[PDB]
Assembly symmetry: C3
Homo-oligomer: 428 residues x 3
C-alpha cells in the first residue's frame, strides 16, 4: 500500500531483475570453466582392432587391444591465462549490468506508483468538474422553469456536461491501465495506495549542475560499464598478441597393449616379428610449439583488435555524452518542474477568482452561462496541471539520482515519507 | 477493397512473414544436419610422400604412396543424441514463432485497414466542418451587406474558416500516410476500401476477464514459446551433464601402401628392412573414451546451465505477467470503448441541440456568431470522437483475440462482415 | 554558429560515426586474416620424452628428443577461397553501412540544429503572447481604477496571463532540452546559432514522385546493402556446396631425433634394435582427401543455405517496400508542408484582423475582454504553426534526400545558405 511496501514486494519477485541476477551468476560461474584448461586434464582410453592383410601382406592378420590413462598439463600458455582474465573481466561487466538493473527496478517501481496516483488525481478532478457542471445544469434548469433564464442556458450546460461524462470514461480507463502497469512490475494488484501529502509537500532546488556532472562522472553505472568494456577491448589486443608466443605442455601416461598375429605367413621366415607382444609403457614428456608464420593470420587479428579498441573508445565517449545529456536535461526538468508548480499554484487561484467573477457577471448580464462553464474548465485544467507537475518533480528527482549512479533504497524511503493517506485505485 | 481481400493479398506476398517461413524451414531442415553425426561417415584419403634421411640415416630415402577408405560410426555417444533432440526442440520453438508471426500479419493488416478508414472519417468530418463554417461565412457576408450584422461577424467567421482550411491539409496528409502504411504491409495501393457499416454497428460485452485469462494461459503463443524455451534450457542442462559420460565408436577401413627405398645405405647390412613393401590392410576396431577429470570444466558447464534454466524460468514468469497485462488492459479498453461510444453518441445529440440554441440566441442577441462557430467546433469534435471510439473498440477486439493466442482468418471474416459501402482513399 | 560550422564540428568528433569507421576498418583488415589459410603455414616443434617399459618390455627404457620445422601449404581447397570471398563481401557490406552512417550524421545534425531554431521560435512567440496579454491586463487594470470597466475584466485577463506564464516555463525547458540534444551529437554547446532567413524563405515543389522513386531504387543505401546481403547469401550456398569437394595439400618438414635406450634388456639378444639412433629427415608430401558420405551433413547444409537465401530475398523485398514508404511519405509530407505554410500565412492575416475586430467590438460592447484574449491566443497559435511548418518543410527535404541515398555535404551547404542572423539559444 505505501511505496516502501510496493517496492519490497516488487524486489523479491520481479522476473526481469531475477533473470539479470541469473545472467550474473552464470558469468561468475564461468570463471571456473575459463580456469579449467590451466588444470590437469586426465582421460581413459581403450580399444580393440582387427586387421586383415592383403596384397603383399596377405597371410598376416591380427587383433590388438590397448588401454591407457593419459594426462595433459599446461606449463606455459599465455592464451590460457588470457582467457581466464577475459572471463573475469566479463563477470565484472555483468556485475555492473546487474547493478544497473537493480537501480532500474527502483526507478520503474516508483514511476509506476506515481503514475497510479497521478491517474487517481485526474479521475478525481474530472469527477469534481462533472459535479460542478452538474450543479450549474441543475440550477439552470430550475431557473429556466421559473422564468429567470432562457432554455439556451440549459442546452449549453447539458452539452458541456455530456462532454465531461465522456472524459470521465477515459480518465477511468487510464487509471485501470496504470493499475495493470503496476501489477506487471510488482506482481500484485493494489486496491489502495498511500497518497502524496500535498499539505506537507515542498520542493528543493537541486545541487549545481557542475557538481552533479562531477558525481555522475565518478559513479554513473553506464559509464563505469563503458570503461570496463574499453579495458576488456584492451585485454583482447593482448589475447590477439598471444598468438605469436610459443607454448610448453606436459604429457604423461600409462598404457598396456596386447596383439596376437595369425595366418599363413605369421611364421616361417618371419623372425619373432609376429610373435605375441604384451607391452606396458609409462611416459612423461614435454612438448614445445612455436608459430613462426601463419599467412598473416596473427597480426591481422591484432590489427582488428586494435580497431575494436578504438570502437570501444568511441563507445566510451558516446556514454559520456549520454550521461552529460541525462544529468543536464534532468537538472533542467527539475528546475522547470519547480517553476511549473509555482506557475500552476498561481493559475489555480486566478482561475478560481475568474470563475467567481464569471458567476457574478452572469447574474447581472455581462457574462453568459457559457463563460461560467468555460471558467470551470480552465480551473479544473489548472488543478490537473498542478497535481501533475508535482509528480513530474518527484520523478525527475529519481531520474537525477539514477543518472548519478546512486539511486537506492534510502531514496525510496525518503519518497515514502512524503506519502500519507490511503486512496482507492478503483473508486466510484 | 474489403478487408478479406486486402488480407488475402497481404498473406501471399508479405515479406516479413515469408522471411519467418524461411527461418522455420531452415530450422526444420537443420534436424537432418543434427542427426548426421549419428550416421555412418565415410571418406577417401590418398597421399604420396618423399623422405630424405640424414645425420645417422643419411643414405636412406624413400617415396611412399598410400590410399584408403575410412569409415566411422557412433555406437554410444549421448552428446550426439542430445544435439539431435536440442535441434528438434529449436525447430519446435521456430514453429511457434512462425505461428506468432502469422497472427501478427492478421493483427497488423486489420489494424492498418481500420487506420485508413479512421483517417478517411477524420478528413470527411474536417471537410463537413469546413463546409458548415463556409455556410456561416457566406450567410454572414450576405447579412453584413444588407445591414443586419456588423463586419465583426464576417471577420470572426473568416478567421475560423482559415483555421479549418489548415486542419484539412493535416487531415489529408494523415490519410495519405495511413494509405502508405497499408501499402507497406500489403504490397498494394487501394483507391477504395469497404467502410465500416455504422447503420448496423453494435457492440458486445466481452467474456468475463477470468475466463479470457484462463484461455490465454492455455493458448497464448508467447507463453507457449516461453514454456518451450524453459524446456530447451532443461535439455541443455542434460547436454552439459553428458560431458561426464564415456563414448564408444566404431572404425573401419581398407587401404594399400607402396614404399620403395633407395640410396647408399639401402642394402649392405640392412637385412630386408629396406626392400619394397606393398601392404594391404582391412581393419575394424572399437574405441572407448572416458573423461575422469578436466579441471572442473564439466560441472562448471553444468552449473552455468542450471543458472540459465533459472533465467529461462524468470523469462516464463515475465511472459506470464505480460499476457496478464495485455488481456486485462485489452478487456478494460474494450469496456471503456463501449462506454465512450455511448457517451459520444449522447454528446453529439446535446452538441447539435446546443448549436441550434446558439443560432436562435444569435438571432435575438443573447449569443454571438462566435458562440455559433464554437458550438460547430464542439459538435464536429464529438462526431470525430464517436467515429474514433468505434475503431478503438474494433482494434481492442483484435488485440484481445491475439492475447488469447487464437486470432485467425475466421475472426477476419467476422470483421469483414461489419463492412459495407466503398469509400475513396483519395477524395477531393 | 551556422549549420555548416556545427556540422564540421560534429563530423570530426562524433563517436557514433567514428565507431562505425572502426567497425569498417576491422572488416577490411579481416580480409588479411581470411586470406591467411591460403598462404604458407610454418611452425617449429621440439620435444623430450622419457619411457619406462613394463610387463613384457620391463627392462627397456629410453629418452628421446626431437625437433622439427613443419610447413603446410594449400594447393586445392575451394572452401578456403570461398571464405576469402565471403570476407571480401562482408567488407563490402560494412562499407555501405559506413556510408549509411555518414549520411545519418548529416541528417541528425541538420535535424537537431532546426529543432533548436524551432524551439527558439516557440519560446519567442510564447513571450510575445505573454507580453500582449500583459498589456491587456495592464490596460484593463488602469480602466478599472478609472471606472471605465468592471473588475470582472481584470480577473479574466489575469487568469489568462497566468496560463501563458505556465506555458513559457515549458517552452523554455523544451529549448534547454533541444540544446542538450544538439550537444550530444556535436560535442559542443552553442550560445547562438544562425537563424532561418524568413524574409528570403521560399518553397519549391518536389520532383515527381515516380522520378524520386526511380532514383531511390538506384541509389538508396539500405537497398544497396540488402542487395549485397542477398549476394552474400548466394555465396553461402556455394560455400555449403564446397563440402562435397576434395582437398589437396602439401606438407614439408625437416627434423632430427635422438633416442638412447637403457636397462636390463637393452642388449643380450636384442639385435641392434636398441642401440642409439640419431635420425634426420627431409620430407615433402601431398595429401588428398575426398568426403564421399557424411550422414547427410553436406546437402542439409546446402538446403539450409538455400532457405537462408530466400530469407535474404524476402528481406530485399522488405527493404524495397521500406524505401517506397519513405519516399512516398516524404513526398506527401513536403507537399503538405507547402500547403500548410500557405494556409497558416493566410490564417495569421485573418486571425490578426479578427483580433482587431474583437478590440473594436469590445470598445462598443458587442464583444468582451474574453473575446480579445481568445483572439490573441488564436493569433499566436497560427504564428507558431506557420513557423513550425517551415522547419517541417526543411526536415522533409532532408528526409527525402536521405531516402534517395544522396544526402551529402553540398545539401548541407544549400541549407546553410537559407540561414542569416544569429539568435541566442539561451535568452531572457
Amino acid at each position: 500500500e505505501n511505496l516502501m511496501q510496493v517496492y519490497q514486494q516488487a524486489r523479491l519477485s520481479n522476473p526481469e531483475l531475477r533473470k539479470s541476477a541469473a545472467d550474473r551468476d552464470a558469468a561468475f560461474e564461468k570463471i571456473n570453466e575459463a580456469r579449467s584448461p590451466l588444470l590437469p586434464q586426465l582421460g581413459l582410453g581403450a580399444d580393440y582392432t582387427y586387421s586383415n592383410g592383403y596384397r603383399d601382406a596377405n597371410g598376416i592378420n591380427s587383433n590388438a587391444t590397448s588401454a591407457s590413462l593419459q594426462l595433459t598439463q599446461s606449463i606455459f600458455d599465455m592464451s590460457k591465462w588470457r582467457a581466464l582474465t577475459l572471463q573475469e573481466k566479463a563477470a565484472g561487466i555483468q556485475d555492473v549490468t546487474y547493478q544497473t538493473d537493480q537501480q532500474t527496478l527502483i526507478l520503474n517501481t516508483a514511476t509506476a506508483y506515481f503514475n497510479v496516483l497521478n491517474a487517481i488525481d485526474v479521475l478525481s478532478y474530472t469527477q469534481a468538474q462533472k459535479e460542478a457542471i452538474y450543479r450549474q445544469l441543475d440550477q439552470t434548469t430550475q431557473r429556466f422553469n421559473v422564468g429567470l433564464v432562457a432554455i439556451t442556458d440549459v442546452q449549453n450546460a447539458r452539452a458541456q456536461y455530456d462532454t465531461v461524462l465522456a472524459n470521465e470514461l477515459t480518465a477511468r480507463n487510464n487509471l485501470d491501465n496504470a493499475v495493470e502497469q503496476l501489477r506487471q512490475i510488482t506482481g500484485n494488484y493494489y486496491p489502495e495506495l498511500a497518497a502524496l501529502n500535498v499539505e506537507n509537500f515542498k520542493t528543493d532546488k537541486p545541487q549545481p549542475v557542475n557538481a552533479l556532472l562531477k558525481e555522475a562522472e565518478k559513479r554513473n553505472l553506464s559509464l563505469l560499464q563503458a570503461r570496463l568494456s574499453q579495458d576488456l577491448a584492451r585485454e583482447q589486443i593482448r589475447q590477439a598478441q598471444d598468438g605469436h608466443l610459443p607454448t610448453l605442455d606436459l604429457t604423461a601416461s600409462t598404457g598396456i597393449s596386447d596383439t596376437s598375429y595369425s595366418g599363413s605367413k605369421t611364421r616361417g621366415a618371419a623372425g619373432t616379428q609376429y610373435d605375441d607382444s604384451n607391452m606396458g609403457q609409462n611416459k612423461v614428456g614435454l612438448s614445445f610449439s612455436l608459430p613462426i608464420y601463419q599467412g598473416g593470420m596473427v597480426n591481422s587479428q591484432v590489427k582488428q583488435a586494435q580497431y575494436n579498441f578504438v570502437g570501444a573508445s568511441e563507445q566510451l565517449e558516446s556514454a559520456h555524452r549520454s550521461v552529460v545529456q541525462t544529468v543536464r536535461s534532468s537538472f533542467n526538468n527539475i528546475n522547470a518542474s519547480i517553476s511549473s508548480i509555482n506557475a500552476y499554484k498561481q493559475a489555480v487561484v486566478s482561475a478560481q477568482s475568474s470563475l467567481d467573477a464569471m458567476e457574478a457577471g452572469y447574474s447581472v448580464g455581462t457574462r453568459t452561462i457559457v463563460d461560467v462553464l468555460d471558467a470551470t474548465t480552465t480551473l479544473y485544467n489548472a488543478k490537473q496541471e498542478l497535481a501533475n507537475a508535482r509528480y513530474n518533480y518527484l520523478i525527475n528527482q529519481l531520474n537525477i539520482k539514477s543518472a548519478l549512479g546512486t539511486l537506492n533504497e534510502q531514496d525510496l524511503l525518503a519518497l515514502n515519507n512524503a506519502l500519507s493517506k490511503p486512496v482507492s485505485t478503483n473508486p466510484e
